[PDB]
Design a protein around this ligand. Structure first.
Ligand SMILES: Nc1ncnc2c1ncn2[C@@H]1O[C@H](COP(=O)(O)OP(=O)(O)OP(=O)(O)O)[C@@H](O)[C@H]1O
Ligand SMILES: Nc1ncnc2c1ncn2[C@@H]1O[C@H](COP(=O)(O)OP(=O)(O)O)[C@@H](O)[C@H]1O
Ligand SMILES: Nc1ncnc2c1ncn2[C@@H]1O[C@H](COP(=O)(O)OP(=O)(O)O)[C@@H](O)[C@H]1O
Lengths: 370, 370, 20, 370
């Protein structure tokens, strides 16, 4: 009946309500070609979208519409929604209701503009905007627990206890997968593997997904890298060329735990989660320590849950029992939560309608959200 | 309609409940209504929006707690109606208000308007067959089995001393103060902020009570303890962060003896006990000195009775046998005597029936109590 | 007996010694 | 050794210094320690690597600013020692610490450990002959010339109302809340991210303070301003890029009156002013209402004094003469009174001498301040 559409900054995920996993999965990209006066043969698309842009990557200027969970170009975001509904899902938006997701502490105008596009342009019967962390917690099954959500757009934390979100203890963070990908691309240039153009941005992203892992101890990993060359793995590109890097596997995702490398002057993901828990009430800290949930693609590095356990225990008192909930399906946890929320019978009375939107306007969504 | 009557022992700190002819109250829980601070975004949360008893004790951090009674005087009448409804409801008693007669309790010399409005609640909103209101001192002596006795009690709200002699309560010898356990806990909180560790929220306030219950003692000589340097004992929170209490643990209960510390010139516990014996007649004084009974929670401090003896030795006439008695069950002494009073056959004569209340009104309730 | 709060070794009472 | 004594008006936001008997403090600079983010490659650069005062204000963007003092409680003691050393150095005062006595200032109801550590710094690291710690309320009344009146103050750290009647400060009626200018500036930043124009860096944080100082106002009726739609007035940043502020300008300083917005159940300024008057004895209340003195920078919002009076009219008893007075120099109120107090001949009796500290220790400082 209802459609769930997790508009992620990287991978735009979408499908149906009451499902195990999403059908439509693709990178939210809109590649426009090299505009030269020379002609093109047997016709082509003026602006590609999704997997088509990824396939024909070499030529196209890959521009993401969402930057840090914030929609910059709205015409680009409108084309991706259109690509999700008609091409991938093969179903009109007028029949099915549409669950959407944004990160917490976003601009207030973005929900209003997102909702305006759904009702005016797409003619949706009913829509809703949920917090990503709230859905990630709902996919995991627990009512209680903090959610250290981390995608390519935005890392953020939302502490919740017994089905009561703590909006003032929320802490949004500028560090994310895209900033890690840019950092890996820079340190690759330092060892003679220069990647400037946006076509190579996806190759270094794919290198980041495969090889990189979180260090248990950074100074120890740096010492072993200088001594031995067993850690130095090789990755072959789409092209037959193959490259080898030693230091850059553990050093790339260390930027999460040490933002000083990127030049952000912010708290690391390990202590940002701690600072979120300390901002909550003193009586409900034990359960937040016990249920330290992870979600998103930036939590898919091997050994990240072990590093979070080391750092949070180091920050917190010795008496506390720290525990990180790190499921196998944490990459697609936000969408799974939306599918379970859409499947419930209580959610049928929580939708916005066309008549309610015509009466109120875009400002009705802020009341419905939280 | 003479079913097994209910014994509701009221009080600002704790509210004891149960049936007549029992050894100990089965239903003891703290007297406050808890309502959630935060927003409930996620479904499957703690329903009701009003938390009383063990749910409120379990989920403190969510709830903005507020005490309905201050100094044995209910300020918020809607909150006490909800608590008395919760007492009767299926979560505690599992019985109707229509079946059983009610035994209510109040501190002496309280506002008569509050006693009238209490009766109005039990007769109109609840449909009670018969109500009876009684004193704390008379009930404490019922539990011990005595008739002669000065009852120095110290609850959360009120401290007072009613001198009874062979079943003759002297109303004009009653000495009362509005300085008690809550003010000592509030005074301890103020000291802890001066030490360093700040507590401000209402859920966060009950941690200070738990510190006061556990780690506090009364020094026999306070000037000697001042001149000496303390050891600074530790305490663990529900969070796990350690707190060095210091001299605030011994200086906190000095509010009971020196009420000039809070900045409110009253008599004090020891002076109230002496003044109650002095205001009574000449021949009754020596019997009243021999029978001094203790009750309430703020008599449970370490070295309380030892210091209360020494203060009586300082004030009272020389070469007189002082005996400050104090049963094992001091906290439930008032409830036990009510259960004993309810079980006796004379109880039927003392109460105010619903028919008598409908005919006369408040005047009949004022006549039957005294 | 059963219930949360009790005091162990305070004694029932504190009494002054009786002289002749 | 009785030289012209130094006044050091301590504060979280701003620190003000000079000598006794002067009309206005000559040396007003912000209380923080800027340290450079970027690496210094080229020679002939800014030397020292620890920036305090006008150099730090001039070169914001280079320096990672961090405040040592939060809520009148120094966390980073090494930074405050460097600030006090910078005050005494040739860049500001051009004097030795050994010659002059010191008048330090602190907020009421602070941690006593900070007061001892403050004294240790002045007596041992600096070699001060005599030190004296005083309250902000008592000094503000010295500046005006009065003895009676409540002193409502609101700087960057603390908001506290001290009722003083004819040279008698009542310590048990001193109300305090940690909801001052810094929390308002932090709440304004969070609102500007909701508007769209996000700020994250520490040098970039002081732009929000400049926005808070310039373009903000406290409305009389907040519900009426919520129903009406704002005009979205502009403000130009130090760069040049314009910012449409919107409803974030007026709802930001509402935090001072409504502390539930940030997520911390406290009194608020208007409740603290009433509560301080109500905690005092009956006969002094009407004189305390007639004499209300404002102070600090967070009382300088547009329509603040008008809102304070409306809130006092709502809470306080009817038909009572309310009068909220203030000095012309509200920021320099506490320093001028200290300079007056220092120049008095009695000041010699009040202070803690170096010899007295070496003999006794912390006890003599706790005996002389209060
Ligand atoms: N196996 C992996 N290891 C490390 N990083 C990964 C891995 N897979 C994906 N990523 C990173 O995470 C991103 C995947 O996005 P994700 O599935 O978290 O949803 P999203 O588009 O970030 O939306 P949201 O912000 O709602 O999570 C990629 O852009 C990539 O940089
Ligand atoms: N062991 C203890 N030591 C010190 N104080 C206690 C102890 N137990 C309870 N109290 C205090 O006494 C209060 C409970 O006393 P109680 O007689 O039940 O008051 P009331 O009957 O007026 O509700 C609590 O609020 C608590 O602060
Ligand atoms: N005109 C103004 N309007 C609003 N806020 C101001 C204004 N001027 C200063 N402030 C705020 O108040 C603070 C100054 O108050 P002050 O009492 O000097 O603080 P401190 O606690 O450091 O002594 C500044 O840090 C600033 O944030």
């Amino acid at each position: 009946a209802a459609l769930v559409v997790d508009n992620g900054s990287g991978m735009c995920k979408a499908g149906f309500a009451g499902d195990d996993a999403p059908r439509a999965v693709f990178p939210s990209i809109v590649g426009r070609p090299r505009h030269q006066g020379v002609m093109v043969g047997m016709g082509q698309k003026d602006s590609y979208v999704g997997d088509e842009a990824q396939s024909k990557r070499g030529i196209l200027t890959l521009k993401y519409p969402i930057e840090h969970g914030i929609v910059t170009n709205w015409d680009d975001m409108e084309k991706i929604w259109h690509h999700t509904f008609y091409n991938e899902l093969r179903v009109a938006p007028e029949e099915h209701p549409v669950l959407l997701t944004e990160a917490p502490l976003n601009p207030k105008a973005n929900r209003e503009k997102m909702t305006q596009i759904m009702f005016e342009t797409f003619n949706t019967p009913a829509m809703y905007v949920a917090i990503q962390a709230v859905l990630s917690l709902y996919a995991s099954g627990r009512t209680t627990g903090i959610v250290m959500d981390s995608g390519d757009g935005v890392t953020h934390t939302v502490p919740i206890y017994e089905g009561y979100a703590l909006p003032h203890a929320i802490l949004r963070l500028d560090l994310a997968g895209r900033d890690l990908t840019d950092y890996l691309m820079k340190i690759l240039t330092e060892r003679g593997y220069s990647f400037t153009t946006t076509a190579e941005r996806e190759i270094v992203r794919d290198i980041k997904e495969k090889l990189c892992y979180v260090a248990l101890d950074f100074e120890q990993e740096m010492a072993t890298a200088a001594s031995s060359s067993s850690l130095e793995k090789s990755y072959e590109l789409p092209d037959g060329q193959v490259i080898t890097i030693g230091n850059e596997r553990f050093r790339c995702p260390e930027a999460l735990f040490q933002p000083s490398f990127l030049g952000m002057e912010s708290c690391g993901i390990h202590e940002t989660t701690f600072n979120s828990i300390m901002k909550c009430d003193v009586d409900i800290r034990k359960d937040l320590y016990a249920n330290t949930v992870l979600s998103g693609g930036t939590t898919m590095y091997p050994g990240i849950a072990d590093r979070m356990q080391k750092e949070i225990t180091a920050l917190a008192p010795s008496t506390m029992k720290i525990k990180i909930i790190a499921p196998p399906e944490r990459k697609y946890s936000v969408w799974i939560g939306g599918s379970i929320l859409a499947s419930l019978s209580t959610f049928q009375q929580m939708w916005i309608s066309k008549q309610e939107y015509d009466e109120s306007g875009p400002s009705i969504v802020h009341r419905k959200c939280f | 309609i003479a079913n097994q009557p209910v014994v509701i022992d009221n009080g600002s700190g704790v509210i004891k409940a149960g049936f007549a002819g029992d050894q100990i109250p089965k239903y003891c829980f703290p007297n406050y209504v808890g309502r959630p601070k935060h927003v409930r975004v996620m479904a499957g949360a703690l329903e009701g929006d009003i938390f009383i008893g063990p749910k409120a004790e379990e989920h403190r951090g969510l709830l903005s707690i507020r005490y309905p009674m201050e100094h044995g005087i209910v300020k918020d009448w809607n909150d006490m109606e909800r608590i008395w409804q919760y007492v009767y409801s299926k979560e505690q008693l599992q019985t109707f208000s229509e079946e059983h007669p009610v035994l209510l309790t109040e501190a002496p010399l309280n506002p008569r308007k509050n006693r009238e409005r209490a009766a109005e609640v039990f007769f109109e909103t609840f449909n009670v067959p018969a109500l009876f209101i009684s004193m704390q001192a008379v009930l404490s002596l019922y539990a011990t089995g005595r008739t002669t006795g000065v009852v120095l009690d110290s609850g959360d709200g009120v401290t007072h001393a009613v001198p009874i002699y062979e079943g003759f309560a002297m109303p004009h010898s009653i000495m009362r103060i509005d300085i008690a356990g809550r003010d000592v806990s509030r005074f301890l909180r103020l000291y802890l902020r001066k030490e360093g560790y700040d507590f401000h929220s209402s859920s966060e306030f009950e941690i200070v009570k738990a510190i006061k219950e556990r780690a506090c003692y009364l020094s026999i000589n306070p000037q000697k303890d001042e001149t000496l340097e303390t050891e600074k004992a530790q305490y663990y929170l529900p969070d796990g962060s350690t707190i060095e209490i210091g001299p605030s643990r011994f200086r906190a209960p000095e509010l009971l003896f020196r009420p000039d510390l809070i900045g409110e010139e009253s008599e004090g516990i020891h002076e109230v006990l002496v003044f109650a014996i002095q205001k009574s007649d000449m021949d009754l004084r020596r019997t009243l000195f021999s029978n001094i009974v203790l009750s309430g929670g703020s008599t449970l401090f370490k070295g309380f009775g030892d210091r209360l003896l020494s203060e009586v030795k300082k004030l009272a006439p020389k070469d007189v046998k002082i005996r400050i008695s104090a049963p094992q069950e001091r906290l439930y002494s008032t409830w036990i005597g009510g259960s004993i009073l309810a079980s006796l056959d004379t109880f039927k004569k003392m109460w105010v029936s619903k028919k008598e209340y409908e005919e006369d009104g408040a005047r009949s309730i004022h006549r039957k109590t005294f | 007996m059963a219930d949360p709060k009790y005091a162990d070794l305070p004694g029932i009472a504190r009494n002054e010694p009786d002289v002749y």
